[model samples]
Target: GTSCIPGMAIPHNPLDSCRWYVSTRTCGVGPRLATQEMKARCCRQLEAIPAYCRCEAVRILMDGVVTPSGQHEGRLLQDLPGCPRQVQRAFAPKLVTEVECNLATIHGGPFCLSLLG
Candidate 1:
C-alpha cells in the first residue's frame, strides 16, 4: 500500500495497487491517500482476482475478525475457504501485510513498522 512495502514489488492492477498503498499507509509507511480513493480503485480492478476468490476475500476483509498473535498472524489468508491454494499463494503476502496493518491498528502501536522496514 505505501511506497511499495520497501522491497515488495508493485502490482499492476489499480485496486491491488491501492490496497498495497492503503496497507502501507495504515502502518504509516507510505503516501497518504483517502479511503474513498482506495475504494474507487478497488472497484475499478474487479477483474484482478477471480470472481469466486474475490468474493470470499472481500468478505473476509470486510467482516472477518482476526486476533493478533504469533500463530494467527497470517491465518486469514491461510484459512480462506473458497479460495484455491494457487490463488491464495499468489495474493497471500500482500494480503498478509494488510491483515498485519489491521492487527497493528486494533492492538495498538507501531508493530508493523518493524515488520515493514
Candidate 2:
C-alpha cells in the first residue's frame, strides 16, 4: 500500500533504512527519510526526553495519538494498488469496500468479517 509518507515510492519495506515523511500534519514524528543509523541515534535522544521514554518504539499518529497503527490505513491502501492490472480490475473498489468494512468493525457494527468469513 501507499505510505503515510507523501511522494514516497511504493512497496517500501518498513525495515528499510530510509524513512518517509508527509508534507502535511498527518506525518508522524519519527525520523523523516533518515538513514537507519541516524534514526537509531535520534531515537536514543528521544528516549532521554521526559514523557518520551518509549517514543522510539512508540508510534505517532496524524492526530498526535500514539498508537501501534495509523488510523489512515484505508487512505494508504486507496493510493496503492500493487499490480497495474489489479488497479484497473479490482483494487479501486476493493479498497473502498475494505475501508467500509474496517470502519464498521471499528465502530462495532455488523460488517463483512472476512473474504472467507
Candidate 3:
C-alpha cells in the first residue's frame, strides 16, 4: 500500500532495475503523475529491483549526487502510488511488509525507521 525498502545482506540484482525505474518515473525534471500505461512500465521496473535496492535508489536519487533531477528527489518518493489503476488491481511489492526490515534503518538502530521509506 505504501513504500519501505527491505535492506538485505543477501545478494541482489544489479542497479539497472533501480536505474530504469527512476528513468520511467522521471521526465525533464520531477516525477511523473503517471498515466496508467506509463505507470505500467514504471511498475514493472519497480518490481525488477530488490526492495532494499529501491530505497538505495531513492536516497541516491534524493541525495542529488547522481541523476539529472536533483531537488525533485522528494517528488520521486512522494508522488507515485502503486501502479496499474485502470485495472483496479495492482501487486504488492512483497518488499515492504510487516516482516520487512526496511533498509533505510541500516545507518543505525532506531526505535523505528523512516516516516516514509
Candidate 4:
C-alpha cells in the first residue's frame, strides 16, 4: 500500500514526535542534498513512520509547503507514501495531479503487504 490515510494517531505513535522525525528526515536537508537523496529521505522516513501516522505527516507536509520548491518537495513526500505499483495506480490521475498537493485531502494510501502468512 502507499501513503494510506491515517484515521487518527495510533497507539504510542504520537503525531508530535512523528511529525518531528518526519520533518527532520524529510525537510531538514535544507537544500543541501541531491533531489534524489531528498526523495530517498522522504520515502526512507516513510518506512520509519508508523503506518497510521503517515497521513498526518503528509498532511502537515503539504499544508505547510508554501513555495515552488515546497510544493514540489511535498509532492516528493506525497508520492513516496504511495510509491508502489499497487498504490501508485490510484495516483495516476488523482493524488499526483498537482491538484491534491494543496488540498491535503487525499486519503493516505494504505501501505500494502501480504507477508509470511
Ranking the candidates on TM-score from highest down gives: 4, 3, 1, 2
Q: Write the per-residue lDDT of candidate 3 for residues 1-117, one digit (tens) a residue.
A: 132322232112223233324433332222343434444454454445544445443343323222233322222222334432211111112222233222223333211233222
What would the TM-score be for candidate 4 when compared with the true structure? 0.31
- Give the residue spans of candidate 3 off by over 4 A: 1-34, 66-117
lDDT of 1 by residue, 1-117 (tens): 223211122222223443433343334333366655653554444334433233333333322323322221112323223433334334422332333322121123212222211
Off by over 4 Å in 4: 1-30, 64-117
> Per-residue CA lDDT of candidate 4, range 1-117, in tens?
343333223212223322323333433423345544444444544445564444444443433223323332232223333242223223222211132222222244442222110
> Cα RMSD to native, each candidate?
15.9, 15.8, 11.4, 13.6
User: Against the true structure, candidate 1 has what lDDT?
Assistant: 0.33
Question: Best by lDDT, which number?
Answer: 4
| Cα error of candidate 3 at position 47, Å | 1.2
Clashing pairs in 1: 1-20, 1-21
Q: If scored against the real structure, what TM-score would every candidate get?
A: 0.26, 0.20, 0.30, 0.31
lDDT by residue (1-117, candidate 2, tens digit) is 122231122112221221122211112233345434444543333223232112111122111222233432212211222222222222211211233211222123323222211
TM-score, structure 3 vs. true: 0.30
Comparing 2 and 3 by lDDT, which wins? 3
Question: Which is better, 2 or 4, measured by lDDT?
Answer: 4
Sorting all predicted structures by lDDT, with the top scorer first, yields 4, 1, 3, 2
Give the range where candidate 1 is weakest over 10 consecutive residues by summed lDDT: 5-14
